[PDB]
Design a protein around this nucleic acid. Structure first.
Lengths: 57, 49
RNA sequence: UGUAAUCCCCUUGGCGGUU
């Protein structure tokens, strides 16, 4: 569909970052909270993006 | 009684399942952080599915 | 007049209960 599902949109060029409501953090004990799995995966993705940008230039 | 009754001693044993350890009710209470639905468990004042 | 307090993980695994 030209308006809604264009074929080139199947390739990701910009990634949407969900709000913390989607990936809430949990207090494992009285002092230390754990990052959610999605938060760690997004951190890894962003590190890889930074690495690619640094290497390219 | 018009009917005679079978009558005698028998060995009975009390099992761990008592009603006061199973009765549970909930009007409102804690909810999960991710889904904002009632938590699971009688010990946590949870809801029924 | 000295005026009292409001908050709870998650994942996992096991063992069970009623069919």
């Amino acid at each position: 569909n030209e308006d809604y599902a264009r074929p080139e949109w199947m390739i990701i060029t910009v990634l949407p970052v969900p709000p913390p409501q989607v990936r809430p953090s949990i207090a494992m004990d009285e002092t230390t909270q754990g990052q959610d799995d999605l938060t760690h995966k997004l951190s890894d993705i962003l590190k890889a993006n930074i690495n690619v940008q640094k290497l390219e230039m | 009684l018009m009917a005679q009754v079978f009558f005698g001693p028998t060995y009975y044993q009390r099992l761990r399942h008592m009603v006061d350890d199973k009765i549970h009710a909930r009007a409102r209470g804690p909810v999960q952080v991710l889904t904002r639905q009632p938590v699971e468990g009688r010990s946590r004042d949870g809801g029924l599915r």
